[PDB]
């Protein structure tokens, strides 16, 4: 009720560079890890602008809202934003289905990377 309350805040972005679409990548679980009964999907999204984007993972089309951790778009030296997204699963779930996507959305555009065992 006011008095001692901070708003949620507005993230103000200053547009100082031409719009750019991200160069997205997807990496399946590694060895040393897979045979350690643990799966982890890595999705790196760097060299974009503005540094605003959203990731929607989707296995066999169907979304995934479980164990979806994502970093915040950090600014690189060259002045383009980068990002990272990890997906946790079991090596039983990894080979079970077939499809795994890193649907990235930036300023309308929808880039998508898919990998399978």
């Amino acid at each position: 009720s006011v008095t001692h309350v901070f708003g949620s805040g507005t993230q103000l972005t200053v547009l100082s560079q031409p719009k750019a679409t991200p160069s997205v990548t997807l990496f399946p679980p590694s060895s040393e890890e897979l045979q350690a009964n643990k799966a982890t999907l890595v999705c790196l999204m760097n060299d974009f602008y503005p540094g605003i984007l959203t990731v929607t993972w989707k296995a066999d089309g169907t979304p995934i809202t479980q164990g979806v951790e994502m970093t915040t778009p950090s600014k690189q030296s060259n002045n383009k934003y980068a990002a990272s997204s990890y997906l946790s699963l079991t090596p039983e779930q990894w080979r079970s289905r077939r499809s795994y996507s890193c649907q990235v959305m930036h300023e309308g555009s929808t880039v998508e990377k898919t990998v399978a065992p």
């Binding site: 009720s1 006011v2 008095t3 001692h4 309350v5 901070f6 708003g7 949620s8 805040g9 507005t10 993230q11 103000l12 972005t13 200053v14 547009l15 100082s16 503005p50 605003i52 915040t72 950090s74 600014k75």
Partner: protein, 111 residues
């Protein structure tokens, strides 16, 4: 609907002027509150930008440039942060707050 509303995100070109919006829920009247603004760049601590009650009742933070100015839309229960000459260092999270200076009572703990 919270007591204070800010749109989560905004963009604009360098050299330009944007207006940030802090809307006080209608259960209160902004005519009596003061609007405060804080800036916070990624990885840094917040810093007090300015306080605005009216043209005749305001204060600028430690060493905050005049290109940051406050205004109030009483009729719309709105506090504003205007930033002209938008620069790359204006890129941050902006938080608002609101202080009445006439908050009291609480003698319901001592009869």
């Amino acid at each position: 609907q919270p007591v204070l509303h800010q749109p989560p995100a905004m963009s604009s070109a360098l050299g330009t002027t944007i207006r940030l919006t802090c809307t006080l829920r209608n259960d209160h009247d902004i005519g009596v509150y003061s609007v405060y603004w804080y800036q916070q760049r990624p990885g840094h601590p917040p810093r007090f930008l300015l306080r605005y009650f009216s043209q005749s009742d305001k204060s600028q933070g430690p060493q905050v440039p005049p290109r940051f100015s406050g205004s109030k839309d009483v009729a719309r229960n709105r506090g504003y942060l205007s930033i002209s000459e938008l620069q790359p260092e204006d890129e941050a999270m902006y938080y608002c707050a609101m202080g009445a200076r006439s908050s009291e009572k609480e003698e319901r703990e001592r009869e």
